[PDB]
Each structure stands twice: as C-alpha cells, then as structure tokens.
Design a binder for these strands. Structure first.
Lengths: 195, 88, 136, 131, 84, 164
RNA sequence: CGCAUUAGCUAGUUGGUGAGGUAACGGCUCACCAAGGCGACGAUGCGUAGCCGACCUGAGAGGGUGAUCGGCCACACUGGGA
RNA sequence: GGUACCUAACCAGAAAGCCACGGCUAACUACGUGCCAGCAGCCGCGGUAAUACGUAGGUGGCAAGCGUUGUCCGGAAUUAUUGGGCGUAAAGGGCUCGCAGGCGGUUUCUUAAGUCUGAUGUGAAAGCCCCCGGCUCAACCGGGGAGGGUCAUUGGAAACUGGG
RNA sequence: CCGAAGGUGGGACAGAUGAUUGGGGUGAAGUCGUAACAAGGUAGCCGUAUCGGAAGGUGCGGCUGG
C-alpha cells in the first residue's frame, strides 16, 4: 500500500499533515498534472465515501455493515456512521497517540498487542464502547514504537483521556461529529449508499 | 410417556439446553408440549434456570424427568418440594 | 377501470418469456419427456463448425458453431475469442449469451470448458476466454 | 342517479374555489350540514348558513379568500367512494399534509375531524381529505 | 359448566325435494385481500328437516351437528320467516 | 414577489443539447443549455439559453435563470408537506425526510433540491425524464408548498391549533 | 392456482327406512323406494404442485420461492391385501 | 483430543488476484490491426491517425475473492389497490331492450351483518425487529420482549354502509 | 362375494413423424411493373363483391384521416 497515492488521488490529507500533497497536489499518473475535469454526482459521492473508508482502511463489507448498523441507531445517519468508525479500535490507538498512522495502529491491535478492560484484543474492527480503559500489557509495556509516539505529543481529543506512563486510555460520553473530521462530507455517503 | 427432558439449542461446539416437556415419541429438537427455562453447561460455573412452579405442575400430572434433568431439579430443589407434596 | 371490474376480471400480468429457452428445459432418457430444469450451462456435441456473417451495416465475419445438446436441441452457439480449437463432434459447454451481430445465435461457447481450449496469446480479460495466468 | 352527494358537494366547493366564487347553494343533507359545520369551525370557510325548506333544503357556503387572492381551501378529495368504502382503525387514522390539512372521518361517536377522532380513539368511515 | 356452543347460521331454503331435508343459502359476504371492496358469496348447506316443515324461500336458522349423512351436517332450529 | 437576484448564487448546469435548424444549405446548429441557479438559503430558479457556442449559451441561461427565481420553504431542512409537481407529463413526488437521509433525487431534481438548500428529500419522478419538464415539475411542486405559519394565518387560526 | 380454444358433470351419485360394518357419525357398505345432487359465486375436465412457519426482493403494497431448521401430510421397487 | 486455548524462540521471511477504463459508469494513454481479426448489455466500435479490437503502462472498482452465466425481485407508475389509460399515440362494444351483478335522493325510529373499540384465548420453537448478555470482535449463540388474523367467544358505540 | 394384475373392445386426449403443400420472416445493388406518400400525376382509406402476372382495377355504400 502506497497510501500517499490514495491521498493525492482523493485530494485530501488522509493523515492530516503538510505531507503527501505538497510538491504534487494532482491525482496520480500520466493523466494527473494536466487539468483534470470535475467529477459528476456519482464521482463526488465516491470521493467522499472513499475519503472516509481510506481514512479508516475499511473494506466495503465492513463499511457497508457499519453503514447499516449506524442506520439502526438514532439521530442523523451520517453522523452515527462517523461515530461508529471513530469507535473502531485502530482509530482509538492512533487517536490516543500510540502510532503515527492507522497502519501502525493496525499492527498494534493485530499483533503488537494492546488491551481493552483486561485480557486482550487481536482485532482492529473491535467497536469500542465508552467507559473502557485501554492500555498495553506488561510484556509490551513500553517498546520503541509506543515509546516514540509517547515522545511525540499530539492532542488528545475531548472524547478521550490519555496518560503517558500508565498509558491507559479512558473515554467520555460520545464523540460528537463536530470533533471528528472537518474535511469528510457526510450525507453524500448516505446518498452514495442510498442508491 | 410425558418426559421433562433437555432440548438441544446453540452453536456447534457450544451447546445449550432448554429444559423442555416433550414426549419420548417426539424428536429431540422437535415438537414439545411446553418448556421450563434453560441449562448452560458450557459456562465455567453453574447457571441453570428452572421455572420451578410450572415444572412442579408437570411433575404432578405424571412426567418423570431424565437423569440430568432430575438432578437439575434437585439442584434448584424441586424434587424436595415434590417429596414434601407427596408427604402431604 | 372500476373496482367491480377489477374484482371480476382482475389485472392480468404481462407474459414473461426467457431470453434463452434451450437452457430452460432438460431431458430424462427412459421417461422420454422433456423436463423443465432451468439450467445455467449445457454441454453438447458439435454438429457443424463453420463461420458466417452478420446482416447489415456491421460487416465482419463471425465464428458460428452449431451444437446439439443433452436435452436434444440443436442451437447455433458462438465461439468468442480469437482462434478456436473446435472440430465437428466436439464437446462444448454452452452459456447463455446473445450475439446481436449474427442473427439466430443466442448462446456462447464457454471458453475453458470440457474440450474448448483456452484461447491463445491473451493477458487481459483472463477468466473470460479461459486462459490461465501464464507466467512472469 | 347522483350516486353519492358528499363527493358532489366536495367538487362543488372545489369548482367554487377554482372559479373563486363566494357563495354556494348545496341541497343540504344532514351529513353535508356536519361537513360544512366542521369546515366552518376549522376556518376553511368564512361562514355557512342553513335554509330549511320544503323540497330538500339549502345549505349556503361562503368561501374564504382571506388575503390578496389566496384560496384557503386549495383542494378537496373524497376517500371512501360508494364502490370502495374506506374504514380506518384508530391506530390507522390518517393525518394529512402532516398536520397542515385534515380528514373528515365519521367515527362511531359523531362525524369527527382528524384530530378529534385521534384524541377520542375511535375509527370509522374516512370520507374527505381537505387541504 | 355449560358445554361448548356449536356453530349456527341463518339462511334461505333452495329446495325441498330431498326426503326430510333441505338446502340453505347462507349469504354472509366479505372483502378481498387486494382490492378491499366487499363482495358476496352464497353458501348452500344440507340441513335436516325431521318434520319436513319447510318451504322454498323460507328464512330459517340451522345448527351444525354430527354428520347426518353424506353432505349433511346441519339441522333446523327456528323457522323464522315463511315464504309468500 | 419577484426575488431580486442580488445574492451569491452557485449556477450549475444540467444539460447542453445540440439543436439543429435545417436551411437550403443544410443543418445549422446551436447549443441550448438549461442551468439551475440559486443560493442554498431557499431561492431557486432555472433558465434556458441558446447560442452558436457552449459558453454564450451558459451565459444566457445563467442570466435568464437569475431573472426567474422561486422561493421554497425549508421547514426543518426539509419540505413542509408531501407534494406532487406535475408540469406537463413530468410528475415528481416530494416527501419530507428525516434528518439523516440526504437528497434522494435524480439528476435535475437533485440539482433543484441541492440549489434550494433543502437537505433531506425523498423524491421520485413518475413521468417523462426530459430535464426541462422535470425541472418545471419540481418548481411547480415547490411553488405550491405551504408554510405552517402562513396556513395558520390563512385559517384564522394559530400554529399550535394546527400542529397538535 | 393456471386454462372457458375445459359448460355441462353425477348415478351409491343425491335423500329416506332397515340392516351390516366401524374406536366412532356417515352410501362407509347392502336391500327397498324417491329423482335427487353440483353448477358461470366456475361444476366437471385438463395442466401444474407436498402445505406452512419462513426465505429473497421491494419504500411499502406486492411479486417470486417452499433448500437447510421446525410442524403436519403422503410415500417405501409397482399394485392390492390383511 | 493434548483440539480450541495460553506461553517462549526465529525470519518480511510462506501468502493477491480478478474485472473494467467512450457514455450510462469510477477509471487513459501508447504500439499493432485496418469493416479483417475481433468487442458488445444498449447506444453501437473497427474501412491507415481505434481512450470501444489485441498488447503494454497506468488508473479505477472490489478484494481471497473477482468476473460470466442461469432464475427471482426491484428499477418498471411496464397490469397502475397504493399507482396508468381510451378525440388524433394501443384502447368507447355499430347501436339498442334488458336478466343476473354493482351502485342508491331526503327526514326519522329501530336493528347491529359491515365498521370502530374493550376483555379473554390463540396465531408453537427457531426466524425478521427491539433490549441486554457470551463467544478475543464479527458472523453466530443466548436471554427478555414485540410483531403478525377479514380468527373464535364475549362486552360497549350508532355517524356511515346494510336490514325492518 | 369383493378383488390387484392381465385379456378383449370401442372411443377420448396428447407428443412425434409423414410424400406433398399453404401462407409467414429474413437474406448477397436479381426480374416485372410503380400501388401509396404532393392534386403522387385516376384523391386516399373502410366494408363488401368481382376481375386481374403483381402491386392493384372496377362497382356499390360510407369517411376526411382532401
């Protein structure tokens, strides 16, 4: 996975950083630095859907089933789907600040183990409910990658609280979608799966 | 004839048993007369749930349980209530 | 119309005809009758492999193999890719695909089938036309 | 003939709207009197008056064009036609233009409106949409 | 403990010609699954007249019962209105 | 009233047809664009424009679209009540929707309802699919809409005597 | 549930009395009489089909399906019998 | 069955393909071909400057799947009850008299078949749905509830349809 | 006594197949005319009869969709 390529095609900083669009803001390829045409309704809905699913790295089976389960909840639809992909556990690891991307946070949940409320979680797609103190076991207590991402100081979002040494990540009420992402346009993705 | 017997529910490797008033004729997962609650074996502890009064109602019309259902009745304590009723 | 007229004559629903009917039947050998099986594919033996032409403005010579099936029906099928193995009396598996250009032909010979070999020198559209992933 | 007079009074009001007439004489059966009384008390009409006579009676309707040229009644409809009668249960009573219009629904306690029959929790014939 | 009540209809006599019996058109009538309008159907039952006190065109009640012969499962209750 | 066009407008187009006229010499072509124009605060309009070129057609269409503007009630970011707009064998129903749905509409209907500022529409075209008559049908359905405040003012009534 | 380019179909069929038979009511079986019975609200005939809880699609109304699982049915190389 | 499982050691080492790229429909260039070979669901491509054929690069879609086929349903308001029509686009019987059927002006009393409402039983278990729980999450399991009858009995209403 | 099967018989329905045949469709710039579309060079069409290689013609009645 190149994943610079995904960002410059989608036209969005999918990390959210000065990287990956500076020096080359066009899409990819031999048909990229020329003036591309604007996309249709279909293309705009695909752009926004794949902005979100390439933020979080989801296949469309999980992405569609979370769209459906978010529809089974209450409120506004596209907000609840953002909320469910910000309860996803790779996102929890990268927003506690334990990795520099979501691939590194994927490898933390997959094998470089990380723990929720006890025993373990080997699964990136684990939806994290509130109230759940997320930390690492005493084996991987402070190793080089989590150590670097502790040395580097990001902001903790207000739907999280994170400690450095004890490293337990605890929660608050719910991640409001004002807090989640400014760039991704929800309710074009609801319209993309409305058809 | 009428027998209070376990009835298999659940996944493959994880069984579950609804304690179910059926006939000896009828199939095990098949048709049945009424049910009392449940039986989790695969819990590492206990956790049986018996209705304890409708089970008692079926015991007195004449319905003799199987061995494991009988000792579940003993664990919740309905066979002692049945013996107190026969001593009544 | 009126509700009483809808009650005593009803709405008669429009007829459905299948686009490929020779797949839409079958055959048992001793009962000597012609069952409705609705099958996706049928193998049959080639009765005549030639080539012939379309009708009007589109003018390029097509491929045209005629096959008698396991239900008993001879249909002219089509051999899609470039350069085909087939002879007369060849075992052929047939899928339903309309060939608009050549008239009277409404099935494809599945390439990669029982005897219809995968096509030669092809790398794009691998699964269609039958050919294996060659080497790299 | 005439086959139902309720639909005919509803079209007579609708044609008087589209022409923007100001008065209507309608031959005034008792259910018509209750329909025009409901449409009076819901402000679709300026006023309605009865003429009790020998032949069959007359009910006169005064259509309300409240502002510049604004048909307060935009359209009428008859739901239960004599040939497909419509009956709604109380948990199926229809609310129309969701709240902004109304449905004359004659339940078991009086010829009611929409909200009245919903709050009295009975159902019956569903016999006019009024927008 | 009063026992369970048997089914009862009222109807209209079609024929008198069978020995000690009649047939009875019950005109209960009902609506569709789809169009909703309510249409009519006439159901003629075989019913026993042990006194044969019936006429064609007679409104009559019938009781259901044990099967009295082939096609018979009904008997008289109260001959309400006589034909003119 | 006629909505005075001094706003910020977004002016995106539906179609440009290439549109012929036969002369002694032969076919002479023009481009007929129709463009929907409006801010997303409740003012919509659309207009046709014809020229030998594509960009002059889009110019004339955006001018004639700014001339005729319509208003739409945006009650709770939806429409107030379900309506069918029926301009001439284009018939389009419009339902209000819940807050999450997004504009459920086909191409030119979607352009009208997005340039209206209405965010949650169930809608469906129940007639012919030319863009011109469908846009006329949508604006017919949005002209006949009614505000609850205005209908309460119409019945000699109050709003809460309607809404409950 | 499909066909009216299937309109007439029944004669133990439709009733009676009596008998036999059945775990039981009954033309279920038999004697003797009566001319009944079903019918365009579709009899009969032909074609198709295990029925359902359910399953798929659909905004829904519907349309299609009747695998698994579960209920009832019918069958056991074909027909008949105990 | 020393099976799920837990614990230690080692190496990015063993592990990605399929389809499409004219429009619908996201995704484009180049070389060869020259109405041939061929593509195609449709509009239709290709007759020496082919983004439509074959290949390469690229991109896009998905992803241990992907594509084709066969049938269902939707799209299709294209059987229209919801929800269509008949002057000229398909469609008013050539016209009448009329049986059955359907529909029925007004006031009032009464009835309660239709209609609405209540109670009771029931529409098994699983399934869809809601709420919680357990499988490392998920699928799935489990618990608890809901739903679904022109259903039967029973009790109220009387506006409307029907009955007198 | 009943009775499955089998036997004989005359019908009924349904599928094949059959010398030959009749209309239909589609097809490489085939042959004969030019009936219709314009006042289409005889206004056309509808019904019906009749004749004629063929489109068609002619009669009668009707229609404007002159």
């Amino acid at each position: 996975g190149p994943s610079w390529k995904l960002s410059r095609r989608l036209g969005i900083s999918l990390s959210g950083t000065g990287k990956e669009l500076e020096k080359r803001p066009y899409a990819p390829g031999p048909h990229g630095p020329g003036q591309r045409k604007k996309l249709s309704e279909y293309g705009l809905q695909l752009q926004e859907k794949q902005k979100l699913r390439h933020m979080y790295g989801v296949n469309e089976r999980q992405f569609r089933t979370l769209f459906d389960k978010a529809g089974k909840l209450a409120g506004k639809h596209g907000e609840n789907f953002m909320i469910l992909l910000d309860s996803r556990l790779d996102n929890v690891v990268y927003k506690l600040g334990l990795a520099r991307t979501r691939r590194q946070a994927r490898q933390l949940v997959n094998h470089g183990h990380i723990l929720v409320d006890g025993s373990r979680v080997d699964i990136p797609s684990y939806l994290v409910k509130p109230g759940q103190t997320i930390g690492v076991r005493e084996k991987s207590r402070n190793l080089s990658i989590i150590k670097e991402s502790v040395e580097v100081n990001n902001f903790v979002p207000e739907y999280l609280t994170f400690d450095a040494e004890k490293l337990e990540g605890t929660f608050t009420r719910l991640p409001e979608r004002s807090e989640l992402a400014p760039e991704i346009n929800e309710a074009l993705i609801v319209e993309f799966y409305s058809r | 004839a009428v027998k209070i017997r376990l009835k298999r529910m659940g996944a493959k490797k994880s069984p579950f048993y609804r304690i179910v008033v059926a006939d000896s004729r009828s199939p095990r997962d098949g048709r049945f007369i009424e049910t009392v609650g449940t039986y989790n074996p695969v819990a590492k502890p206990a956790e049986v749930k018996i209705d304890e009064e409708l089970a008692l109602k079926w015991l007195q019309t004449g319905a003799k349980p199987s061995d494991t259902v009988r000792n579940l009745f003993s664990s919740q304590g309905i066979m002692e209530k049945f013996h107190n009723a026969k001593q009544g | 119309p009126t509700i009483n007229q809808l009650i005593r004559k009803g709405r008669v629903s429009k007829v459905e005809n299948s686009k490929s009917p020779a797949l839409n039947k079958g055959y048992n050998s001793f009962k000597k009758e012609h069952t409705n099986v609705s099958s996706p594919q049928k193998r049959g033996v080639c009765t005549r492999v030639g080539t012939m032409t379309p009708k009007k403005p589109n003018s390029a010579l097509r491929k045209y193999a005629r096959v008698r099936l396991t239900n008993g029906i001879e249909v002219t099928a089509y051999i899609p890719g470039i350069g085909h193995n087939l002879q007369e009396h060849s075992v052929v598996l047939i899928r339903g695909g309309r060939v608009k250009d050549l008239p009277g032909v409404r099935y494809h010979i599945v390439r990669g089938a029982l005897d219809t070999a995968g096509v030669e020198n092809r790398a794009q559209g691998r699964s269609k036309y039958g050919t294996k992933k060659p080497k790299a | 003939v005439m086959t139902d007079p309720i639909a005919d009074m509803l079209t007579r009001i609708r044609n008087a709207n589209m022409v923007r007439h100001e008065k209507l004489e309608i031959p005034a059966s008792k259910l018509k009197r209750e329909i025009a009384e409901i449409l009076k008390r819901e402000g679709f009409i300026r006023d309605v008056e009865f003429v009790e006579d020998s032949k069959q009676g007359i009910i006169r309707v005064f259509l309300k064009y409240g502002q510049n040229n604004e048909r307060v009644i935009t359209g009428l409809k008859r739901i239960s036609k004599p040939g497909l009668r419509v009956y709604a249960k109380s948990n199926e009573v229809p609310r129309v233009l969701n709240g902004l219009g109304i449905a004359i629904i004659s339940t078991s306690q009086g010829v009611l409106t929409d909200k009245e029959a919903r709050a009295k929790q009975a159902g019956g014939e569903v016999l006019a949409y009024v927008w | 403990s009063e026992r369970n009540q048997r089914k009862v209809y009222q109807g209209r006599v079609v024929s008198d010609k069978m020995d000690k019996t009649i047939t009875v058109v019950v005109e209960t009538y009902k609506k569709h699954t789809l169009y909703g309008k309510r249409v009519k159907y006439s159901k003629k039952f075989k019913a026993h007249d042990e006194n044969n006190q019936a006429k064609i065109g007679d409104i009559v009640k019938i009781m259901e019962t044990r099967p009295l012969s082939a096609t018979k499962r009904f008997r008289l209750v109260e001959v309400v209105e006589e034909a003119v | 009233r006629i909505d005075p066009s001094k706003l910020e407008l977004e002016e995106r187009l539906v179609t440009v047809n290439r549109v012929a006229k036969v002369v002694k010499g032969g076919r002479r072509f023009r481009f007929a664009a129709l463009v929907v124009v409006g801010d997303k605060n409740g003012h919509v309009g659309f207009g046709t424009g014809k020229a030998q070129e594509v960009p002059e057609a889009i110019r004339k269409a955006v001018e004639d679209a700014k001339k005729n503007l319509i208003e739409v009630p945006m009650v709770g970011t939806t429409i107030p009540h379900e309506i069918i707009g029926r301009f001439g064998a284009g018939n389009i129903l419009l339902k209000p929707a819940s807050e999450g749905t997004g504009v459920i509409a086909g191409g030119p209907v979607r352009a009208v309802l997005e340039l209206a500022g209405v965010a949650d529409i169930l809608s469906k075209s129940l007639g012919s699919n030319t863009p011109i008559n469908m846009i006329r049908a949508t604006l017919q359905g949005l002209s006949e809409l009614k505000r609850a405040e205005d209908v309460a003012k119409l019945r000699g009534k109050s709003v809460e005597e309607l809404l409950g």
